[PDB]
């Protein structure tokens, strides 16, 4: 009916939720505005998104708006057990344990679609595309397409076996559920990229709102969020001194940028790697030495990958690294580091999400969260405030695709700027940030209304 | 023939160009790449752009590409005399003096179009849109439209007089010149906004390249440039101690962002104003107190405007200010501050571009560059390296519109991403910034090619 | 031995393996003095936060020949896995995270109770509690009225512990006092206490002020707090730093580190001070300098760093806004008027995190019940910076044990050449390459190429 | 009665003062607090200190507190002629002309001891110790010691010639002047050095206050002052871009620490060299790479020296540097850089205080101020606020010695901490910094009084 680590943690979860709500004015404002109206009454939402305290506040907001939901995490180490307990105790089905196996993970992703009345979900709230991919690959398998062979990875084999179990247990499930989905809201860059791949190949059968690319998501969550929680995760994992140390940051997109500020602000000296010349130029301009990991690996104290790509930190890199160098990843998936390549070496667990890996020559590495997003694995992810900006976009995205589904075609959308502006505006008071108002004449003079939007569609901020 | 302050400054100018070239790899790469093939042979370029050492390197670069140019500055205080002189000494006609009057400014603007063979220019390279407007408003006047009446500013009246003057001396001039322009490239936000007004009204009769919105322009020039050059201007103008002082930055776009960094990085404590809630939330997140000038004026030590709007610092604000508060503008035009409203009071010149204005109660203000761009007025504007990234776009813009004019409609375009990435790429070596190369598998994995472009069309960086 | 759970020892040992690679000072001292055993015969009573870092120190003192008995100097600052690892070696330790006041003082007394019945001969102290216990006890034994009118609950427990000891083994305090060759004192608040003793003629043995080594006060107190303040506030509250206003009370070494901690994490810092010079430094460093009276009502975070008392009062706490976070990183829990909060409704959120509700409904988040939140809510300063602090401790123990007769009953600091050696020992770890003076250069500036490089009272 | 370059420039001097005063709250507040009580009535002060506008404000402050004064520069080139003029217009004897002869210099030093009533000085206010040493050496000569033979330098022969001139002219002048000095204050490290040697050899015949080691003066000059004026100097000189650049700072004392902050704050990436392991460890902990100039020279873009040593940047380093490396000294005071060693290479002057030096292989260097102090050479020295903190120390020292002469032995003393604190208080209000007051209970608790001093004699702050 629910799967959590320990239901007795509910009370603790609840207390922290009391606190988080005072930090999340966006979601609370959505409860005020849409509670009575109940725009999501009739919504049947399967959520796949880090089961944190922040996600719990979102979940309860969705419910206040009329939705029924079933939830699971989008990572095996990112759950906050007391958050999961507190949500479970309300009766909302949740399947999320910090430290679950891969098999369990896919079992749980499946569970979010298994409603008691035997009818399907009609909405997906996704982070990384795992729930979306599960349905769409499932359905194609059910249509006879050969899509469950030649598994590239362990994780992929486990995903396949889970699709096979579901096909056998309830034939027609995927087909039926693919058709039942009114729309999906996608939270993160890696997820959005998967959406665009689908659209480009004509494999997206319903509309998606790209939540990541709201300005109040990508330029806040991905950047400030990582600034807050990257060093947090490293610190809890290792308790290492930042001052005096060299940290190499692989990638200089939004996450990479935030990550560099996280480390720099703590006193580490930051070096950056990149493949995009524009982002690399930014990094240099921002004061950072721009290197390759091939050149910088053997003298780094800390190495962090932020790319969304793969094989960024390889076994060759890790052999060069000096004793006790700290290795971690804060991009969505664990393949940015070649962890699988380290499995034939001697591992000593230090504590949860902290492992000492020993090379033939006696050199040791400290690996965080087994190569999974270390901010959520080693700590608690992004603070409540920033998550409020992200999740308010999520709420608006859900309202759009559920209540105005016919306005949308089978493609990836972003929310309109006036909504983006609304989201930021909701978070200003909380910080005691006083906004100036344009005179009618000033607005005229620069080509806008006093009410906004204030920028052209593709302004970059 | 030419008009500069003092032709004997040429040697100094020349020595600073030898140095400046080592700081502008973008422009020097273009000379190597397009020198022999001479894509601008037959170009007759009228340039209206701050006549600085940086612009001088651009001018020589355009000549090396085959172009013949005639130049003027786009601001009465922004010239560097020794740069103007070095350019005049090569025989290129240049009409720019630091501290020219309004009348002189328009006389020079007109001169850039007066070729010795009596034939019109065929290209414009513009910053602010003054040279473009002149031709266009002049042409309309010639067609009998009533565009020369009810002038709002002293500046508007002198522009009208100059247009009439030219109409009488050489009838048909504006119309024959309008028709002869193959294209215009526009440098800055305020100019680009003017262009969009035109296009919108159907009043753009040729293609325009919006250089401002190149990523390697807006996110570098407008941000990092002002970071370098705002306090530079304030220090040269006032020698005030920064640590311990409170500065108010009005606006938090690309310029306000850089301006804030400029002051903070020098030790001042920075408060920010904004009308855009997303930009305000960025400023609060960046650790700045977000206030209204109404509330903050009376205790500020420094007040700077960066909006490109008008009437941002009013007479009411300046009244509230404390004795010796420094006031400046770094947006494109002198109407952001209500300087006209100060003409009423007792001025005392302190030195070039620094005035002490005394209110009735005896309260004094220090006004910088008479409320015009203080970075260029009180110092020398942005350093060479950043102007190289900015100006390398200009050169590519000219090459496009001059060699491929038939591919463009009467609209505002931006350069393609691959060119933006090229520009960045040409600046990496100068900084010892070494780029990583995607493996074939890696590029496939994220949906790009190893040669780029690496980001979707509207990626915000 | 008393620890939370001896089964944590393996975990503690793994983190010691790691900590050692971060603490080259201590490991160097093992190399230099291990065979020579300068502390052979030393019987050291240690009262210092029983963290992983302190565990590396303890093992270093043992490599040098010492026998030790250890207790923490704060009820919340122990890391149970460190305590366990140390206990597993056979070294007597008495330290549990979350001990009661009564337990604390039982453990402080335990560090002086050796199996053979003979007294300790050295004290390694942090905050002065172990030193005060012996000194106040010995005066009570000599008949002085020093155990009356207790001014706090904690003071009451101390008096009862002293009375309990005098009853069990009469004469213990007098004999232990006389048996102490010397004490080394780690922290500002402890040193302050020593100076008060010396001024009154109540210091009966030499003390090394380890806090005022440049490689301690200008590193530990500053960089240490830079690293660990925000750490403790994040683990306790997971609050967003960006966009928030934090008021730091005090701008000495710790207050300076603390401001950097919060600012570098995104918070906007305002600072209070009583010392005009320190205030001017704050303003020069870019911080708004305010009174808490004025700033209290709009702050999001308020942190005290003074070593003083009654800095954050009931009146301030009344003015604060709902969900304001309140903590202290000075040595003692009286900087904040915690006791004045005791009749209000408290709800525990989790260890060292409490929600306190006022009559009007306004709630505050108090960290570690007003005790050092870096050690309370996280794990204190990182190993590297503590290696600097603890290498000074080792050198100070060696001094007062091996050369006791060269010191009078006063507070001393280590000579500059030892201070420079400590810094030197930590350079390689960071890949910091030092330049060497030419003979002529040295002469030109009035030094030798070997150092010391600065005058006695150079401020750095 | 006065020697200045042009009494005509006096009105302009005054206009400069009006501005500078508003930036020197310390000295001004001194005037409001002590003006009425006239604690320097009866003072007859002989001053020797760079005759700048800042020093003019100091001077007038001394007169406001009742002091009668005669003044000269402590340097032949430091005099700002309109300051002198403004001061001589007061009726105050000033003997200072920018560019004065060495002979004339000593003649002006003598003139500050020649009062028209024929009686002697009773106080010396000194920077560098030339005015103190002149009286003391002269008096040793008049007591018959052989001290005017064996001049080490031709600059010393000017000294000795000048004492014999005065000895011959008015027998006993020196003996009687030495006996009349109540006390002297000293501003600089070199001046203190000389005095402390007098003291060690029983040659110090009166109390001296060492002001250089006040916290509010050593920190304000050395660190905050150089923080404000380093990057400023380098910009005015080269207009180079800081962002993206590597700057090597030689030495990490107070001047080095400020210099590092100046550069990092402007966007440069700072490396640091040191011989002192404590300072080096400070640098690494402040997040700077700690290197030897030997290793870092070939890739530096800016190298600045701050050591106060000699032969810091040698010809061997300069040969290794890349083309267009900028090289400067902010220490003291020439000879940190081996400039002379470069005199055979091709020098091309770019403008005042900026020289291009070319090596045999075409490698050029940009050298600032010929390797002398660049903050004075290319900028305008330290800001007024900075100098206000430092000159307020002189004042308080003067009051202290003049009014409590009896409390002092003939030794060098540092300024009492309560006065150091007083200096700070005097600047707090201008900054808007509000001081908290200890309760009587809090004060006893920590072992001080509510009035301070608040720290022990050797607290390092
Ligand atoms: N942990 C979190 O809380 C969190 C939050 C947001 C996003 N993410 C994840 O982080 C990843 C990155 O997100 P983003 O918003 O920064 O995307 P982004 O595209 O803005 O930036 C990724 C950057 O990595 C660079 N890159 C790619 N391959 C590289 C390589 N081999 N070496 C060096 N650089 C390389 C790209 O040029 C790009 O600039 C995604 O997986 C995203 O889903 C995680
Ligand atoms: N001097 C220079 O070196 C330089 C360089 C680049 C651009 N500019 C000029 O600076 C101006 C700003 O350009 P930008 O690139 O920053 O454009 P931008 O649109 O990114 O920034 C303008 C910002 O000002 C804000 N704003 C508008 N009116 C306001 C008001 N009344 N009060 C407070 N904030 C207000 C807007 O919300 C906007 O975010 C333009 O005129 C541009 O041409 C100057
Ligand atoms: N938590 C830790 O890991 C850690 C580390 C080192 C020191 N400490 C403790 O921190 C405390 C401070 O030590 P420090 O080394 O910074 O001492 P310090 O003397 O250098 O700093 C204390 C400052 O507080 C100021 N102050 C005093 N009362 C004040 C008041 N009522 N309001 C505002 N400011 C006031 C003083 O002027 C002084 O500048 C001591 O208790 C010390 O033992 C803790
Ligand atoms: N330009 C100015 O406005 C200004 C102002 C004050 C002082 N100064 C001058 O600056 C110099 C330094 O002053 P300070 O207050 O920093 O004194 P300081 O003694 O505090 O700093 C000197 C530092 O230089 C280091 N050093 C010495 N030789 C070195 C070498 N070969 N390589 C690397 N580091 C070396 C020393 O270890 C010491 O830490 C003095 O000569 C002083 O007169 C200049
Ligand atoms: N504490 C958190 N709770 C929920 N989601 C988070 C948290 N921190 C980061 N994320 C989200 O996780 C995604 C990374 O997979 C990002 O898109 C981000 O929005
Ligand atoms: K969190
Ligand atoms: K420039
Ligand atoms: K620790």
């Amino acid at each position: 009916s629910m799967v959590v680590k320990d239901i007795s943690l509910a009370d603790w979860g609840r207390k922290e939720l009391d606190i988080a709500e005072t930090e999340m004015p966006g979601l609370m404002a959505a409860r005020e505005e849409f509670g009575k109206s109940q725009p999501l009454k009739g919504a049947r939402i399967s959520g796949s998104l880090h089961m944190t305290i922040q996600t719990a506040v979102l979940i309860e907001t969705l419910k206040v708006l009329g939705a029924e939901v079933r939830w699971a995490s989008c990572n095996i180490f990112s759950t906050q057990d007391h958050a999961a307990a507190a949500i479970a105790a309300t009766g909302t089905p949740v399947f999320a344990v910090k430290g679950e196996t891969l098999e369990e993970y896919w079992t749980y992703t499946d569970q979010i679609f298994q409603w008691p009345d035997g009818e399907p979900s009609n909405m997906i709230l996704d982070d990384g595309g795992d729930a979306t991919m599960y349905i769409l690959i499932g359905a194609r398998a059910e249509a006879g397409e050969d899509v469950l062979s030649n598994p590239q990875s362990e994780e992929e084999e486990v995903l396949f076996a889970q699709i096979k179990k579901r096909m056998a247990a309830t034939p027609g499930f995927f087909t039926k559920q693919r058709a039942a989905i009114k729309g999906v809201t996608e939270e993160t860059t890696t997820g959005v990229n998967r959406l665009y791949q689908l659209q480009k190949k004509g494999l997206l059968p319903f509309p998606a709102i790209n939540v990541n690319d709201s300005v109040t998501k990508s330029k806040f969550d991905n950047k400030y969020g990582c600034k807050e929680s990257l060093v947090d995760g490293i610190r809890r994992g290792t308790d290492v001194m930042m001052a005096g140390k060299v940290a190499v940051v692989c990638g200089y997109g939004d996450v990479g940028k935030g990550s560099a500020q996280s480390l720099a602000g703590a006193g580490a000296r930051v070096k950056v790697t990149e493949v995009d010349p524009i982002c690399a130029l930014q990094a240099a301009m921002d004061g950072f030495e721009v290197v390759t990991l091939d050149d910088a690996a053997s003298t780094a104290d800390i190495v962090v990958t932020t790319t969304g790509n793969k094989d960024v930190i390889t076994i060759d890199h890790m052999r060069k690294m000096k004793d006790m160098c700290i290795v971690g990843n804060i991009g969505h998936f664990d393949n940015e580091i070649q962890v699988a390549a380290l499995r034939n070496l001697k591992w000593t667990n230090v504590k949860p999400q902290v492992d000492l890996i020993e090379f033939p020559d006696g050199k040791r590495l400290i690996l965080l969260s087994e190569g999974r997003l270390l901010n959520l694995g080693n700590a608690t992810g992004h603070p409540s405030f920033v998550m409020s900006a992200s999740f308010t976009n999520q709420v608006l995205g859900q309202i759009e695709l559920f209540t105005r589904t016919d306005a949308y075609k089978n493609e990836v959308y972003v929310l309109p700027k006036h909504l983006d502006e609304k989201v930021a505006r909701l978070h200003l008071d909380k910080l005691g940030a006083k906004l100036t108002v344009l005179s009618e004449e000033q607005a005229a003079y620069i080509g806008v209304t006093p009410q906004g939007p204030f920028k052209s569609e593709h302004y970059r901020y």
Side-chain angles (χ1 to χ4, degrees), chain A residues 1-35 37-149 151 153-154 156 158-196 198-200 202-408 411-433 435-461:
Chain A
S1 170
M2 135 255 294
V3 181
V4 304
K5 178 64 173 206
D6 185 354
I7 186 70
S8 78
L9 302 174
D11 280 344
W12 170 23
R14 175 56 56 192
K15 289 170 188 173
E16 288 200 356
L17 273 139
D18 288 336
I19 296 176
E21 292 163 18
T22 69
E23 282 294 299
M24 307 186 71
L27 294 181
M28 304 300 294
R31 292 176 189 194
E32 269 310 318
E33 174 176 13
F34 302 111
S37 163
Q38 296 248 273
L40 301 181
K41 195 59 212 240
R44 293 156 68 86
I45 313 187
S46 306
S48 179
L49 166 45
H50 309 295
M51 187 60 261
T52 66
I53 296 293
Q54 293 66 46
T55 299
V57 188
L58 161 62
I59 288 178
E60 294 203 309
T61 302
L62 296 168
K63 290 167 68 181
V64 155
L65 263 50
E68 276 189 356
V69 321
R70 298 176 67 83
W71 218 273
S73 194
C74 63
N75 187 268
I76 58 173
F77 294 136
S78 72
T79 295
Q80 293 191 275
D81 288 333
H82 58 298
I87 289 292
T90 69
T92 286
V94 50
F95 311 81
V97 178
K98 179 172 187 70
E100 67 208 17
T101 74
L102 287 177
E103 166 156 24
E104 279 167 357
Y105 174 62
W106 288 113
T107 300
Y108 301 161
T109 305
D110 180 87
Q111 271 297 333
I112 62 183
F113 294 98
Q114 309 312 315
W115 301 74
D117 61 355
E119 292 295 283
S121 313
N122 61 20
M123 292 290 292
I124 296 191
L125 198 156
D126 217 354
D127 183 334
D130 266 11
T132 297
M133 168 180 62
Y134 178 69
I135 299 308
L136 298 180
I137 295 190
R140 288 158 63 192
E142 236 164 29
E145 218 176 322
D146 181 38
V147 293
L148 305 174
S149 312
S153 64
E154 167 188 15
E156 212 172 82
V158 199
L159 159 74
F160 290 171
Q162 169 67 44
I163 292 171
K164 283 167 175 184
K165 306 184 214 163
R166 175 46 61 192
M167 294 180 63
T170 44
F173 161 80
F174 294 107
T175 303
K176 171 82 178 291
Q177 173 66 88
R178 173 186 169 287
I181 300 294
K182 289 168 134 289
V184 61
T185 62
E186 173 56 50
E187 170 81 21
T188 196
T189 319
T190 279
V192 167
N193 191 61
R194 273 164 161 192
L195 286 177
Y196 286 124
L198 287 143
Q199 204 208 282
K200 189 196 190 219
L203 299 178
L204 183 66
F206 38 72
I209 300 262
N210 167 2
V211 168
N212 185 68
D213 286 296
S214 292
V215 180
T216 53
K217 196 294 175 160
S218 61
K219 300 288 288 227
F220 290 84
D221 184 317
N222 301 31
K223 145 97 133 286
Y224 302 114
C226 292
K227 178 174 173 179
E228 305 263 354
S229 63
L230 172 70
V231 150
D232 192 5
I234 300 185
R235 281 207 197 277
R236 300 193 200 201
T238 67
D239 294 298
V240 72
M241 188 80 172
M242 294 289 164
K245 293 211 168 50
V246 179
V248 178
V249 173
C250 297
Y252 206 74
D254 288 324
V255 180
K257 285 177 175 71
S259 294
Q261 295 309 315
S262 192
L263 294 141
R269 172 157 45 90
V270 171
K271 306 173 168 183
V272 174
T273 81
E274 256 285 1
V275 300
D276 174 321
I278 305 201
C279 295
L281 192 57
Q282 284 183 302
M285 297 298 279
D286 292 336
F288 303 120
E289 192 182 348
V290 181
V291 305
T292 64
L293 183 61
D294 289 343
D295 292 340
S298 73
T299 57
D301 296 308
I302 300 178
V303 187
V304 170
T305 182
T306 65
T307 75
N309 211 322
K310 68 171 180 167
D311 302 290
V312 182
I313 295 176
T314 69
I315 188 59
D316 294 313
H317 293 142
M318 289 174 275
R319 303 187 178 109
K320 291 185 190 168
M321 297 182 176
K322 60 167 168 182
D323 185 55
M324 289 301 170
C325 173
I326 293 151
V327 181
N329 164 57
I330 197 180
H332 191 81
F333 282 131
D334 70 307
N335 58 0
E336 305 214 17
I337 300 169
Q338 291 179 348
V339 182
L342 304 159
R343 294 302 182 165
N344 39 255
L345 307 168
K346 167 191 165 195
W347 290 41
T348 296
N349 185 62
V350 170
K351 66 181 195 176
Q353 289 76 69
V354 182
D355 299 279
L356 217 44
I357 299 150
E358 185 178 333
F359 279 73
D361 65 303
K363 193 211 43 219
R364 294 157 307 180
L365 292 188
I366 298 173
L367 179 60
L368 301 174
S369 286
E370 295 185 40
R372 281 131 160 114
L373 347 71
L374 75 81
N375 58 336
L376 285 144
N378 284 95
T380 64
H382 296 353
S384 302
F385 188 79
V386 74
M387 293 318 294
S388 177
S390 298
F391 287 165
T392 304
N393 284 290
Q394 280 291 1
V395 168
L396 295 166
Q398 288 283 318
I399 293 172
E400 281 307 302
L401 292 195
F402 181 77
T403 74
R404 311 193 19 180
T405 324
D406 48 19
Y408 295 90
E411 17 186 313
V412 177
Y413 294 74
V414 291
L415 296 172
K417 189 184 285 320
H418 72 103
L419 285 191
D420 224 337
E421 292 187 350
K422 186 187 183 195
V423 163
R425 194 186 289 276
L426 287 170
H427 293 80
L428 292 177
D429 305 274
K430 175 71 192 158
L431 311 177
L435 200 67
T436 292
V437 179
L438 288 168
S439 80
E440 209 67 38
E441 207 167 2
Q442 284 171 328
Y445 180 87
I446 60 183
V448 310
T449 72
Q451 299 80 23
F454 300 100
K455 302 284 180 306
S456 78
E457 188 183 352
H458 297 299
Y459 189 71
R460 300 184 174 94
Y461 307 88

